[PDB]
Amino acid sequence: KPLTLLMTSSTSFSETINQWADILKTMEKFDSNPINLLELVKQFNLYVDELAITCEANNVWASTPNLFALYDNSGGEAIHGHAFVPYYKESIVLRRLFTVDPNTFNLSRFAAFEGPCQLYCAAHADSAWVKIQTLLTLGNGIINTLKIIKQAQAFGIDEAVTENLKALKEQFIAFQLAEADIKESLKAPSFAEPNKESEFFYPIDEKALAKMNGYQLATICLEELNSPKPSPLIERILSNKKFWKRINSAFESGVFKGRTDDPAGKIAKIREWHQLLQISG
């Protein structure tokens, strides 16, 4: 009397939940083993990306340091591969914070924002950011609960395949309530509104940029290589001779080694690009 949870009367996370909520809303019988969590991760990640786009388009975040700028206690140090840069766009921090890795089903670390964000949450409970965290966190959760359930069952732990499964479902409900709150907020009107320099950061003036240290600057350069085509922001950073000593120094510190986005390849490229730009400034 098998009941593995059914994949496609939905191809988008929000709906695909409720084809699932639906039939966990509708009992005794369950092979979670056949379930595609990995597909679920693929959908959720789109959900996150699409929710981020939307937020940045509706101006929902309202120099222009970002929201989390005043809560940085990092001392410009690199926290697990990332340094704090007050010019990250909120929607990128969003992405970095809630997108699930398909290879581990866990998060890639975006540590320098982990604390400032929490602080920001504690000081603006009504904020949009919170309502979004609440939502996407439940998305991470649902994902997790499924992971657990699969292996618990796979291991025995009848206690485990059971007490969660009550919860997995229970999360579905709070999600919805979340989708509902978030939704109304994004329905709000907004005036029209782009930065040519970067996909990831707000505009950074000459003054602002020079005040960055090697970890901060390296972090920016690594972030820019996430774009398919060389960016004006990185050409500005790499073409400036005064910046290099501290950028390369940070590379050598070994601090970026653990990153998941091929820091070795990125760094090798950055060094090549700098070599090129060093000629003819």
Ligand X SMILES: Nc1nc2c(ncn2[C@@H]2O[C@H](COP(=O)(O)OP(=O)(O)O)[C@@H](O)[C@H]2O)c(=O)[nH]1
For the annotated binding site, the residues are 109
CB 19, CB 153: distance < 8 Å: no
Residue 103 binds to ligand X (criterion: CB under 6 A)? no
Helix (H, G, I), strand (E, B) or coil at 88: strand
Residue 118 binds to ligand X (criterion: CB under 6 A)? no
Residue 230 binds to ligand X (criterion: CB under 6 A)? no
Residue 100 binds to another protein (criterion: CB under 8 A)? yes
One residue of 258, 260, 262, 275 binding ligand X per CB under 6 A: 258
CA atoms within 13 A on the CB side of 184: 6
**Alpha-carbon Rg for the chain in angstroms:** 22
How many other C-beta atoms lie within 10 A of the C-beta of residue 97?
A: 20
How many residues make contact with ligand X (CB under 6 A)?
A: 2
CA atoms within 13 A on the CB side of 173: 6
Spatial separation of the C-alpha atoms in residues 259 and 101, rounded to whole Å: 12
How many residues make contact with another protein (CB under 8 A)?
A: 31
Query: Between β-strands 78-79 and 82-83, what pairing exists: parallel, antiparallel or unpaired?
Result: antiparallel
Binder of residue 6, out of ligand X, another protein, none (CB less than 5 to 8 A by kind): none
CB 60, CB 84: distance < 8 Å: no
Site for ligand X in 170-199 (CB under 6 A): none
Residue 58 DSSP one-character state: T
End-to-end alpha carbon distance in the chain: 71
Q: C-beta of 210: minimal distance to ligand X in Å?
A: 30
Taking the least distance from each CB to another protein, the nearer of 81 and 204 is: 81
Taking the least distance from each CB to another protein, the nearer of 65 and 141 is: 141
Q: C-beta of 109: minimal distance to another protein in Å?
A: 4
Catalog residues that contact another protein under the rule CB under 8 A.
79-81, 100-101, 104-109, 111, 114, 118, 133, 137, 140-141, 143-145, 147-148, 151, 155, 157, 167, 257-260
